[PDB]
Amino acid sequence: QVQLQQPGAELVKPGASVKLSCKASGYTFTNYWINWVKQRPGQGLEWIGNIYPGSSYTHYNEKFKNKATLTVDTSSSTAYMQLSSLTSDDSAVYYCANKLGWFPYWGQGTLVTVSAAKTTAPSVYPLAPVCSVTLGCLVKGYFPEPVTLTWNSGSLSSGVHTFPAVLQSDLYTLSSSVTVTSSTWPSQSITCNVAHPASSTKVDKKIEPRGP
């Protein structure tokens, strides 16, 4: 299976540069074009440029000629995009994608946040009901975006609502609910899992019934 692996996040100081990676597997990397695409939060898709890894032949959108540089490493089958002198207009998700004949495949995207604020890992709190059943998970005080929240390591996916984060004081907070049959819990195990890529942290919190 064709796959393109991108890191979830890069925190970048204003005026600094960043180099984004895109690791390819499942096909011959040198033989197909790699494209890069920008998406600002809540906005549309914009094409940056492409590169043919066997030769390093490139095309750039004129709009990005002084912002982006595309290269490859044919030993590690990795594509790279360097972005220079970042401003707040550069905060966005950046996707890599390839083209195998008519058929494109996409990476998951890297969220670049341009800010002088420091990385902060979240505090994660399990929320049991008041003394179907609904459980919650509160993810408080992190920076930058994103996190990845799952229930039971992704095996519990139905009846889940994970909400958009809210920003206050250079820190984000997010919540999630999950709704199961009352015979399911607390007889069986339900755990919230939270990964924060910018701090390389992963935390698990089992939901336990409240005591006296």
């Binding site: 914009e46 058929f103 998951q108 709190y125 609904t134 919650g136 005591g211």
Partner: protein, 219 residues
């Protein structure tokens, strides 16, 4: 550059009915090789774009036969014969005939389903948070329609407005409803000075308030 125009930012549709989404190019996308160089994609929240149609009219593997693509050399249409909940998201056209490649600006589908009452759940602060000196109370109002909804917090019967932050989901991919989370953040000392906590909502599905409460010491 070739300009790609999707003139509608959003299109409403009743579940079960057909919808057509338009895209126009500033010049013909017909190649000398006989193929028309036009893609359609669907993007869901937080996800990479999913291929729907390639070469203007070919249905991609795994995409239901409810989807089709047609067009001239400059006016293109994505048609869904019967819209289902899973079809919600933002639709994009893309030309790849000439560099630079260019996308249209996106069209969101809005599914106008039947009214649905919210399911409300309230959560006292986690004991683990209290050790840190803070106390967040959370209220979920889940699977309701339409999107408009009010929440009010009351402490010992008096309205509390400060310290409340709210967030809403996009339309659910299975039932087309909305959900909302409301968080009231207090210091531990403030939380411990009161006993009754109430999340009170209003929504068009009821002529009276929808309420969930707890007493801090009732365990």
């Amino acid at each position: 550059d070739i300009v790609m125009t999707q003139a509608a930012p959003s299109v409403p549709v009743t579940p079960g009915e057909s919808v057509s989404i338009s895209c126009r190019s500033s010049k013909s996308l017909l190649h000398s090789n006989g193929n028309t160089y036009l893609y359609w994609f669907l993007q869901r929240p937080g996800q990479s774009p999913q291929l729907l149609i390639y070469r203007m009219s070919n249905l991609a593997s795994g995409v239901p036969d409810r989807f089709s693509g047609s067009g001239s050399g400059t006016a293109f249409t994505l048609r869904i014969s019967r819209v289902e909940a899973e079809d919600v998201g933002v639709y994009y056209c893309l030309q790849h005939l000439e560099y630079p490649f260019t996308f249209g600006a996106g069209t969101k589908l809005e599914l106008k389903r039947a009214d649905a009452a919210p399911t409300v759940s309230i959560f006292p602060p986690s004991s683990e948070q209290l050790t840190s000196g803070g106390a967040s109370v959370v209220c979920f109002l889940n699977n309701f329609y339409p999107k408009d909804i009010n929440v009010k917090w009351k402490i010992d019967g008096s309205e509390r407005q400060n310290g409340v932050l709210n967030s809403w989901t996009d339309q659910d991919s299975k039932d087309s409803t909305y959900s909302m989370s409301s968080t009231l953040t207090l210091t531990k000392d403030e939380y411990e000075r009161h006993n009754s906590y109430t999340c009170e909502a209003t929504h068009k599905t009821s002529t009276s308030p929808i309420v969930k409460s707890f007493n801090r010491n009732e365990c």
